[PDB]
Symmetry: D2
Subunit: 398 residues, 4 copies
């Protein structure tokens, strides 16, 4: 809930979810693959039915021991009453929002939300009678003026996608609660991996992650999670279940397994990405660095107050708009950074966007820069090698 | 499309989807686990973007080589233009219907639809402005009188869940097309495993399966599929994608692998379940047998005309309503049949329902029986042992 | 057994291992955690008796497979290995010492021979060979230092079926303490009940029919009570184990082994009968085909056939003819291994067979074609074979 | 190397194996399909050189791991095994024949000793032992038939660090053709660059730090150019391989090996320093701790430490005291193995150590506690240890 992580977080990451009933003697939970779950007697079936959302084996779509172990781990780490599981982050966002809306409702979403989240609202929700309005990520307490009589969901994403703006969550939450005390406040907390920003301790109701990113941590598994408080858990659980949302047991196991190294990984991503950001900030070919941990970045003071650390994803703006030829010369010839979507793994990644491309995914807003934007994921490689790779890139476009 | 399977179906099941680009030298496709997919150059990224729904590697949520292989296999076997993948059958049903509706639309669903499919309509669609009407499975050509000006989707399930009624699909499709030529006709084709009833050859637009059942075939993996014709594919693909629907690469691999034994498995399930059904039909403690392949069962003549075989799931009605004590004595003491939900695996399963329980999931209808209903899945055990197990059960309740 | 299909579906599936699912859980582990010193003492005492102790001894997943294999093949224990070749090499090694002698059928799988001639020989263990139809005359080849008699029925590639009752009885008359072993992969351990015939250890490349899908490798060795502890402890000293996931997939393969084998039998016998009438075929080696070597023993001693067999062409094909033949099949694929759902094809020149037939000569001079008959439509497979014949006629 | 972290992230990741993903594909196979006779001939010629041929030689997934291991440990080839004990047993077996002699450190992992005394001995291969600090004096133990010198640094349990340069130089003076091998598991193959010191083969239980999560078992042996072909072919004749999925998980473990090891080093040295000041501790065996046996060689020859070490209590605990101590830890768990994210604890009575110290005597009489220091908060681990001390004070 503040700038210092729990003195026990690393111990919690190692131990979360690892109860004997799930591990059965191994260090990690067993992998129980199942659709059918067998009842020995009618009485056992009746008991399982009553407890089918409470961790008694009932049916594979409700979960096996492997899912229960992960759910317990996520609830412990994010401080929630329940954790719903999904095939990926985009499914978690879409189905968590859908669980709390109906015809006539209004959603208020940050204009820096991940593009698939925006597209779910404009292309799916709208045709189902749910409207979406937008807010600047630094709106703070002034979000109160945007809350409508039918506003049901306020959707935060801090830091923002691509441009990395950090919300003032305490100011936003206080303003929402003044006007609409029972609104459902949700956050896409993927960048913090759910642990660098303790969303539920700030009065957010549901913390959603693309567990694909830092929880899996190796670029090889896709999964979404949504951890809800006690007020919102049953509605989330049952409405996600009605949409058939689940993850396979093996990916659940790999997510639990990813948690165990999340501390050592995040500490490296923080150290390395802050070093790269500080270097870029001094570079003559860089106009702006968007890194939550870097002084001067948008919302940095809220990151410093409200987060316990940084991950490895950030962006910067070049001192000019690259031509198509320069973009190819720059991006095609990196040695260590690879061009790909996603982030959160062990490898460093790079992508580029022109300002007007970002403006097109900033609803009701324009961008305040004119140079080409570069988004970096800083992996686990030696930082001096990453710096040399970036320096060679600068020399190709100077 | 008729009573004789393709003389090449077993060869197709062995070979479907197994192209060198996916197998890379092994018999089976490779398992490619990925969120990030790497582009060597800007030009490669642009090409992948253009082809991101056409089998070029782009992003893990669109698929890896493993998904592409399964999609090709399903399109070949079910005769479709594309195959969308989902975390389970219930997600396939919910998201395929959702892909084709918006506020003000009407869905017309068989009253024997799988209960989660009904619950999606009444508990999710209704609050989003989409209404649902119901029809008796033997309505045939008279469904024309139920089509409303706003009817957009007609949802079939043949045989029906639990009670096993077989639709007259040719009569239903012809009537729908007379009134509403551009309606979206969908079927839950899980019982036929997509191959015993060639839905798209009958003018159905989308064939949905709980691939969990016979395609996986071993009770240990959950996955949904939806194979669409060319008219409906792009809308299904893009709207499922906006809801984040996908399956993990490993389950995709296991589904492809399940296809390879689907022929030998189904032939055994057919032989054994028909033998058990014929025996039950002669039994003094049995009032009715609901097996599509058994003469006298509801819609049997449509099964014989339109299907190329049977799977192993069916039900029967006892000569009396069991008391709770009798239900326990019966179900708790089977040696080979196990009590569990799901079906389609190698093991035989048993469940029971009282008539009023079934009536509660027959919208706008009553049931026409008063005895306890028993649903059997006939697995791969020796049929004479299964018969002995059923006979011992009868002796416990006589 | 009128109950084999029921046994295949249920073998190894006990609540201790399944924990509510149909299949065993997959327990991945090196470390296995003891709650207390008392618990560790109990696990130590029972570390080879199915109590969790250490990943190399097994997890719940391995125990479930071991129980399944012991039930199906009628043994006291089942050792697990990374592949069939490891099972053969380490099972033999477990029972020999310097100065011992091994008697092995000359139709044994080539890697099994190479283990004997290239590993055992440098460790002071000699190997002699016998014709697969030797029957009771094997007693004349038994030496005072012969410790192991190694059978393989049907034989590799050429498919000769031993007279196991005659061999066993002769061995027991002369060297009752000998360890009799069989590579029982072709029968999947279930079409020939090796331990019921007085064989001590039944070894399989579970890679083949038990896995059943060409996508996993694993060896098994099921031993009677007399030989189990020596097999288990010596294999363990060599570090032999299989991973938990492959153990799970082997248990899972058992569940369809009946339906698969019945189709392999039906389809392969049809193909063999057709080949046996074909003008371009010189000989068919199928145990289930009347006239094949040892067929009378197959009919008496086996409960069915699998899908692997071979035939001899009318000529020793040149490289050019072999390419025209093999390169252009549509359904049969060129690969090693067998036992899966796909049909496969492999050629062996008769001279290369002679080279893996120690102290024997082959009685054929044409190219030998080994077929694995998979789950494709049999008429399509026959058409593929016919098109191949037309490319070489 | 100032580039080790970059190498760990990138090793083995070539487009041929990754096919567009970040990690290698998982190719599960026994059968590998040849399109043509020409293709099969090329695969046969190159069946040990990274062309797809047969599942036992490897698939793309194995090849990627093999390239990663060869890059990281600087070798010509890497053989893969079902576990570390199989790697040790089969790597030694690959280079000995009847009449040969093995010289092994008396601090070797107990299964490695048992392989020598219970397997090799019955095959005509003898084994002698040496103290881990023998240094150049090992030349006096080398016999005309000594074929293998087997090192393990730090030693198992007691953590003594060899003077590898002195041992190697002495061996090369007297028996230049000898095969020098090391079990390099504690260093994860990367904190001690064995092949750069003139050792021929670096063996690991990749189960430990390479997998890194206590959930998979695998052995590796990386050989120089002189020894690779003999290791590769003899291991293959014993059927030694690992499954493709475990190979994938080992490659995947490499990616976090740097961040993991740095934390294991930092945390374990802090714990060791605290124990070294503690009134209830008699001795601390941590290579990175000044005063530990061979520490000067660790400081000179290693680039860091992992998280496994041990200490000796002031007394030989009774069963009752040992239960009060071990049963009630909250974070350290009782288990065998190590190298994962969890902290583990294991006790050894000094007499049981003497029994696995051939031709030596232990110089301590208290109970030895071996700790694996995992990724938990170090202050929590210290508190857990302190509570344990209070239960036995
Ligand atoms: C990547 C991303 C997602 C989407 O998750 P997927 O697993 O790729 O579907 C959701 N939220 C944020 C912030 C993301 O960066
Ligand atoms: C089982 C069932 C489903 C649901 O599939 P899941 O994989 O269990 O989510 C859908 N349709 C039918 C006909 C079913 O029987
Ligand atoms: C295939 C084969 C083996 C070896 O099996 P692998 O797992 O491939 O090493 C052993 N015995 C027989 C009869 C075989 O055909
Ligand atoms: C653990 C151990 C081994 C054996 O590894 P396994 O994979 O468990 O068989 C080998 N060497 C050392 C040093 C070990 O600690
Ligand atoms: Cl409100
Ligand atoms: Cl992205
Ligand atoms: Cl219309
Ligand atoms: Cl069900
Ligand atoms: Cl072969
Ligand atoms: Cl060939
Ligand atoms: Cl250990
Ligand atoms: Cl202990
Ligand atoms: Mg805009
Ligand atoms: Mg009703
Ligand atoms: Mg010969
Ligand atoms: Mg001693």
């Amino acid at each position: 809930h503040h700038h210092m992580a729990d003195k026990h977080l690393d111990t919690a990451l190692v131990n979360a979810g690892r109860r004997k009933k799930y591990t059965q003697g191994s260090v990690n939970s067993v992998i129980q693959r199942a659709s059918s779950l067998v009842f020995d007697t009618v009485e056992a079936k009746k008991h399982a039915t009553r407890n089918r959302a409470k961790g008694e084996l009932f049916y594979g779509r409700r979960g096996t021991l492997t899912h229960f172990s992960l759910q317990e781990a996520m609830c412990e780490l994010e401080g929630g009453a329940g954790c719903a599981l999904f095939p990926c982050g985009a499914a978690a966002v879409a189905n968590t929002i859908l669980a709390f809306v109906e015809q006539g409702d209004h959603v208020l979403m940050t204009n820096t939300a991940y593009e698939p989240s925006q597209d779910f609202c404009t292309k799916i929700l709208a045709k189902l009678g749910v409207t979406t309005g937008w807010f600047d990520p630094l709106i703070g307490a002034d979000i109160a003026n945007l809350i409508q009589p039918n506003t049901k969901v306020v959707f935060l994403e801090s830091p923002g996608s691509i441009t990395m703006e950090v919300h003032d969550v305490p100011a936003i939450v206080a303003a929402v609660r003044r006007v609409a005390p029972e609104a459902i406040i949700m956050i896409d907390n993927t960048w913090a991996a759910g642990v660098l920003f303790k969303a539920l301790d700030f009065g957010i109701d549901i913390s959603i992650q693309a567990a694909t990113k830092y929880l899996i941590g190796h670029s090889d598994g896709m999964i979404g999670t949504a951890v809800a408080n006690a007020r919102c858990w049953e509605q989330l659980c049952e409405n996600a279940y009605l949409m058939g949302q689940m993850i396979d047991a093996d990916t659940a196991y790999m997510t639990s397994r990813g948690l165990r190294t999340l501390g050592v990984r995040l500490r490296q991503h923080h150290e390395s990405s802050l070093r790269v950001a500080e270097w870029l900030a001094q570079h003559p070919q860089v106009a702006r660095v968007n890194h939550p941990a870097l002084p001067g970045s948008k919302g940095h003071e809220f990151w410093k107050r409200d987060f316990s650390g940084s991950s490895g994803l950030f962006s910067f703006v070049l001192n000019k708009r690259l031509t198509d030829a320069e973009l190819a010369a720059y991006l095609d010839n990196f040695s260590l950074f690879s061009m790909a979507y996603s982030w959160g793994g062990f490898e460093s990644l790079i992508l580029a966007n022109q300002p007007e491309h970002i403006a097109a995914i900033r609803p009701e807003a324009e961008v305040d820069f004119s140079g080409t934007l570069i988004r970096l994921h800083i992996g686990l490689e030696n930082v001096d090698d990453l710096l040399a790779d970036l320096a060679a890139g600068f020399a190709r476009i100077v």
